[PDB]
Amino acid sequence: QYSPNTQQGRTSIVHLFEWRWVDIALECERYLAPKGFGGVQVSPPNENVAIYNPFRPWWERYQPVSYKLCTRSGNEDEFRNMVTRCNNVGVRIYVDAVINHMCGNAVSAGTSSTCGSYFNPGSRDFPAVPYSGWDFNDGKCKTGSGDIENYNDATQVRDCRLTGLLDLALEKDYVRSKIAEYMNHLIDIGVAGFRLDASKHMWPGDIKAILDKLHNLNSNWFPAGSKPFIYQEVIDLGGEPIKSSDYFGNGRVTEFKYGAKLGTVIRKWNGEKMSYLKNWGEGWGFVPSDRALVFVDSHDNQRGHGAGGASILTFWDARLYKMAVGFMLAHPYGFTRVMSSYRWPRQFQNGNDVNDWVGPPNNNGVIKEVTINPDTTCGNDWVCEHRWRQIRNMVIFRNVVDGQPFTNWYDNGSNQVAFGRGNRGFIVFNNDDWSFSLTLQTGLPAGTYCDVISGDKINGNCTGIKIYVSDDGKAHFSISNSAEDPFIAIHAESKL
Ligand SMILES: C[C@H]1O[C@H](O[C@H]2[C@H](O)[C@@H](O)[C@@H](O)O[C@@H]2CO)[C@H](O)[C@@H](O)[C@@H]1N[C@H]1C=C(CO)[C@@H](O[C@H]2O[C@H](CO)[C@@H](O[C@H]3O[C@H](CO)[C@@H](O)[C@H](O)[C@H]3O)[C@H](O)[C@H]2O)[C@H](O)[C@H]1O
Ligand SMILES: *[C@@H]1O[C@H](CO)[C@@H](O)[C@H](O)[C@H]1NC(C)=O
Ligand SMILES: [Ca+2]
Ligand SMILES: [Cl-]
């Protein structure tokens, strides 16, 4: 469960939120593989409800109608084609598995689905699976509304509807089998693992019963006995009967406290400063490193739809975001997931964004293709953070320092810190309102290194800042509080 199953030397996965299968296939070959990315988290590949009010929101993909690989991202052929090509180049695919529920109970019956499948929420009829009233928890839920009303009662959190979404009776072997049938179909196609959506709303024991029916990874690409990588989405920030530690037996879990705390520290909210990050990790109340999937922001909380709230950093906060992602990718704690989003028209009113529902860039509902600009950036309103030099170069930085310990930490008692990873890497941050100028111990061998944040090493030279390391491993760093990117990073592979 716990191993990502990525190729030796690749330590991160990227979430290509709402991308089309064909675009991802191309991305695997032209960028992901050459730049050292380990894998890709894709949006739910199964048939979902088509919602026109509001116009095709991103969240309609979390309301399943069937298990047919047919969505706005593409059909089953294009999906299979994407997995094959990505695997052939060393980049794995992780499927977002929405297995806790089906669509909202209020949705109108008919054929308003991404594949024309018929469904009737009112009578609990989903013929394309098939599921009937006997496969839902309507009789098991005890709340008066039928939905989840209090998260302090772990029982209704699991047996009732999450904001109206019809809740699957996962204790029934029939339902467990229909779900395994779906996941095994994907495993046999070549996927390397799954993100279990709304895992908090499922009993750890029901999840385990389903994972027991799963096949080993495809023997054409993976070594015999390979088990699918499993990370469960559980939002646990304390103060609830449900703890993410209850799911350690099924696989890893999403550590939402990670992004929340990093955001407040980097924003310097209510007393926090970067010097406190010295004991970052479990020392902060986080889950063990070998059970954590970490990230700065997610498709959910980057638009206020998840835990984290106001402190969360996103592409909208470019400068601070790059630093946050940089710290995460440099730090040894957990398995890192990089975000890749699209721009939407944020419309704030009373502190809340009324356009948080807006779906991906599209032409009358047809998702726009991801175009690549001459400078490697993306067009058609795709942000492509994974293509930002500062982020892409930190992904590579993680690969280079994989395995090296945390050493040579430094801080000015405020917001200027630095630390290294064994003798393969070093990073410096200046988040104070004044310039940083000092000679630090880097633990790196003597030589001239290229700063991978400001530039790149291109055939014998640096296109940006250059750092000189002496025999005793010391080097001088200068970062004005006015730099576009107030941090510098160098590693063994950026060495001249
Ligand atoms: C969103 C978050 O809510 C909880 O998170 C709780 C948290 O556990 C608790 O501790 C406290 O912080 O409150 C949070 C919000 O209630 C869960 O614990 C967690 O698992 C879940 N996150 C994952 C799963 C779902 C569901 O399929 C997705 O929802 C996403 O899809 C849903 C279905 O299309 C959307 O509902 C939409 O459709 C419903 C249909 O009846 C409508 O009633 C609803 O008004 C509408 O917004 C939802 O807005 C969106 O966020 C989401 O994208 C995905 O990341
Ligand atoms: C690096 O660039 C300089 C010019 O700025 C050039 O003289 C030198 O030969 C280059 N080195 C390599 C290895 O390409
Ligand atoms: Ca449930
Ligand atoms: Cl997530």
Architecture of domain 404-496: Sandwich (2.60)
Query: Does residue 104's CB lie within 6 angstroms of at least one atom of ligand 1?
Result: yes
> Can you give the chain as a three-state secondary structure string?
CCCCCCCCCCCEEEEECCCCHHHHHHHHHHHHCCCCCCEEEECCCCCEECCCCCCCCHHHHHCECCCCCCECCECHHHHHHHHHHHHCCCCEEEEEECCCEEEECCCCCECCECCCCCEEHHHCEECCCCECHHHECCCCCCCCCCECCCCCCHHHHHHCEECCEEEECCCCHHHHHHHHHHHHHHHHHCCCEEEECCHHHCCHHHHHHHHCCCCCCCCCCCCCCCCCEEEECCCCCCCCCCCHHHHCCCCEEECHHHHHHHHHHHCCHHHCCHHHHHHCCHHHCCCCHHHEEECCCCCCHHHCCCCCHHHCCCHHHHHHHHHHHHHHHHCCCCEEEEEECECCCCCEECCEECCCCCCCCEECCEECCCCECCCCCECCCECCHHHCHHHHHHHHHHHHHCCCCEEEEEECCCCEEEEEECCCEEEEEECCCCCEEEEEECCCCCEEEECCCCCCEECCEECCCEEEECCCCEEEEEECCCCCCCEEEEEHHHEC
**Ligand 2 neighbourhood includes 155 CB (under 6 angstroms):** no
Where do the CATH 2.60.40.1180 domains begin and end in the chain? 404-496
Instruction: Indicate which residues carry an active-site annotation.
Output: 197, 233
Which of 60, 300, 339, 354 has most ligand 1 atoms within 8 Å of its beta carbon, as the pocket-test mutant? 300
Could you confirm whether domain 2-403 is CATH 3.20.20.80? Answer: yes
Domain with CATH 3.20.20.80 in the chain: 2-403
Write the CB contacts of 399 (distance below 8 Å, at least 6 apart in sequence): 9, 10, 11, 36
For this PDB entry, the determination method is X-ray
Among the bound ligands, the one closest to the CA of 54: 1
Q: Record the tokens describing residue 388, joined without a space.
A: 């930002």
Q: How far is the CA of 59 from the centre of ligand 1 (A)?
A: 9
- Cβ–ligand 1 distance for 260 under 6 Å, the answer no
Q: Is 458 in the pocket of ligand 2 (CB under 6 A)?
A: no
Q: Whose CA is nearest to atom 8 of ligand 2?
A: 460
The resolution in Å comes to 2.2
Distances in Å between the Cα of 298 and the Cα atoms of 18, 104, 384, 392 are 13, 23, 14, 18
Mutation pick for ligand 1 pocket among 18, 233, 257, 305 (CB with most ligand atoms within 8 Å): 305
